[PDB]
């Protein structure tokens, strides 16, 4: 079926500009308690998540160096160490990954 008449700009402005089509203001937004970079409630802060994913990426690169090739996947717990930081006695059999940094003041 085809239009019988050209819709004017008055009818079009009445359609495409009503509150059902406008963008709704959201108010879930506040500052993150650490780093102040404006998260959303019920959502992890993208800055802090970027921090954690960068450090996790470097740990996974060191794991991939220590495991040699694929299909290796050891049968022991792992644990990471930074510079200094002698292995505790409770982490005896656990795999030791040490990269090189100071231990950051959120990973304890």
């Amino acid at each position: 079926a085809a239009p019988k008449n050209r819709r004017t700009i008055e009818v079009n402005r009445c359609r495409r500009r009503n509150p059902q089509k406008l963008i709704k203001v959201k108010n879930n937004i506040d500052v993150c308690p650490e780093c102040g970079h404006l998260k959303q409630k019920h959502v992890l802060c993208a800055y802090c998540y970027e921090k954690v994913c960068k450090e996790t990426a470097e740990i996974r690169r060191q794991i991939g160096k220590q495991e040699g090739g694929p299909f290796k996947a050891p049968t022991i717990e792992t644990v990471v160490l930074y510079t200094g930081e002698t292995p505790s006695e409770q982490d005896q059999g656990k795999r030791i990954i040490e990269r090189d940094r100071k231990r950051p003041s959120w990973f304890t």
């Binding site: 495409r16 089509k21 963008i23 203001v25 959201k26 879930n28 937004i29 404006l38 959303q40």
Partner: protein, 166 residues
């Protein structure tokens, strides 16, 4: 092509007299030839229009559209030029006064319909304009209560005359 929104930042007013108000700062900035349709950009420009600049950045950081990052870049660099060049002293003390979008120069392509037939596909472009004014954001116009409605109705009834006579 006409570029006058860029030239509005080059107005220079005379020096104000001591017995006068402040005349708040006015900062115009725009980004030309954005690869985005002017209607979809207009919806974001209507979202911002009255808000403060920090609230505008907060709403635009979490809106999931292609134009949101673009307008966030324009508002951030307008804030930077406002603090640096046009002598606004507080970075937060700016509100969006005007916010709109215009058509940019488009290209044309063929669409290759399904017989020996075709359409004219058009590669859409648009602009974004913004005007900042220092000061707190103005309060919204409150909806009229029954007192104002009654006062206007009684004023209407008091206004009428005996028509078509002396």
């Amino acid at each position: 092509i006409s570029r006058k929104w860029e030239k509005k930042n080059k107005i220079v007013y005379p020096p104000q007299l001591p017995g006068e108000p402040r005349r708040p700062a006015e900062i115009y900035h725009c980004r030309r030839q954005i690869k985005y349709s002017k209607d979809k950009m207009w919806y974001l420009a209507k979202l911002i229009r009255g808000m403060s600049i920090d609230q505008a950045l907060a709403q635009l950081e979490f809106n999931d559209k292609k134009g949101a990052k673009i307008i966030k870049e324009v508002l951030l660099e307008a804030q930077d030029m406002a603090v640096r060049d046009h002598n606004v002293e507080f970075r937060s003390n700016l509100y969006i006064a005007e916010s709109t979008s215009g058509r940019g120069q488009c290209l044309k392509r063929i669409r290759y319909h399904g017989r020996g037939r075709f359409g004219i596909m058009e590669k859409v472009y648009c602009h974004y304009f913004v005007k900042l004014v220092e000061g707190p954001p103005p309060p919204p116009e409150p909806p009229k209560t029954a007192v104002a409605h009654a006062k206007e109705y009684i004023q209407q009834l008091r206004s009428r005359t005996i028509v078509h006579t002396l």
